[PDB]
UniProtKB/Swiss-Prot annotation:
Pathway(s) it belongs to: tRNA modification; tRNA-queuosine biosynthesis
Record's protein name: Epoxyqueuosine reductase QueH
Pfam family, one: QueH
Gene Ontology biological-process entries: queuosine biosynthetic process; tRNA modification
Residues that bind [4Fe-4S] cluster: 7-8, 85, 88
UniProt superkingdom: Bacteria
Reactions that this protein is recorded to catalyse: epoxyqueuosine(34) in tRNA + AH2 = queuosine(34) in tRNA + A + H2O
Keywords: 4Fe-4S, Disulfide bond, Iron, Iron-sulfur, Metal-binding, Oxidoreductase, Queuosine biosynthesis, Redox-active center, tRNA processing
Entry annotated with the keyword Iron: yes
InterPro entries in UniProt: QueH
GO molecular function annotation: 4 iron, 4 sulfur cluster binding; epoxyqueuosine reductase activity; metal ion binding
Family: Belongs to the QueH family.
Disulphide bridges: 167-169
Length: 178
C-alpha cells in the first residue's frame, strides 16, 4: 500500500486513473488563505465521495502554516520553480513520508506528479531524497502521461469540481497578479 499526498482535486482525478490501492493524505499548509484551503479540501472530499476513495485530512492551523513559512521564507523573493518551491514540496513530502511510516505504508507518492505546472525531475529528486532519509519507498510515475491530465480535466468538468488558478501560497497569488 502507498500513501499519496493530495495537492488538489484535479491532480487527484488525474492520479486515480493510474493507481488502485492507495490511501490519500490531504496536507497543504502552503495553501492560503483558509477560505481557499477549505474550498480545495471540499473539492477533494467531493471526488473521494464520488469514487469511494480513502482520504485522510492533515493538520491545518496557525502553527502548521507558521512551520511551512519558516521552511520557505529565506527564498520568498525567488520565483516559482526555484529553491522556494523545492523547500515547499520537500516540507509537504517529508510530512507525507512520516505519515506513511506511522500508518504502516511501505511506499509514498504525491499527486503533484500529475500537475502540468510542476517540475517532474525536481519532484523525483525530492521523493528519492526523502526515501533515503526515512526508508519509505518513493513511488514515481509520470501521472500525466497517457494523456491522463486530459482525463482529469474531463472528469473535473463533469463532476463540477473546482479548478484553481494559482499554485496555493501567498507568493503564487502575488505572481498571478504579476
Ligand atoms: S508556488 Fe506552489 S510549490 Fe512554490 S512555494 Fe508556493 S505553494 Fe509551494
Amino acid at each position: 500500500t502507498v500513501l499519496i499526498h493530495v495537492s488538489c482535486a484535479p491532480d487527484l482525478l488525474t492520479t486515480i486513473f493510474h493507481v488502485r490501492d492507495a490511501e490519500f493524505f490531504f496536507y497543504n499548509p502552503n495553501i492560503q488563505p483558509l477560505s481557499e484551503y477549505e474550498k480545495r479540501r471540499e473539492a477533494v472530499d467531493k471526488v473521494a465521495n464520488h469514487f469511494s476513495l480513502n482520504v485522510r485530512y492533515g493538520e491545518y492551523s496557525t502553527e502548521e502554516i507558521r512551520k511551512w513559512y519558516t521552511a520557505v521564507k529565506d527564498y520568498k523573493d525567488l520565483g516559482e520553480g526555484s529553491k522556494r518551491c523545492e523547500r515547499c514540496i520537500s516540507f509537504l513530502l517529508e510530512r507525507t513520508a512520516q505519515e506513511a511510516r506511522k500508518r504502516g505504508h511501505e511506499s509514498f507518492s504525491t499527486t503533484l506528479l500529475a500537475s502540468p505546472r510542476k517540475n517532474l525531475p525536481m519532484i523525483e529528486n525530492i521523493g528519492k531524497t526523502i526515501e533515503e532519509k526515512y526508508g519509505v519507498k518513493f513511488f514515481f510515475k509520470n501521472f500525466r502521461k497517457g494523456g491522463a491530465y486530459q482525463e482529469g480535466v474531463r472528469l473535473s468538468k463533469e463532476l463540477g469540481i473546482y479548478r484553481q488558478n494559482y499554485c496555493g501560497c501567498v507568493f503564487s497569488l502575488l505572481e498571478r497578479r504579476e
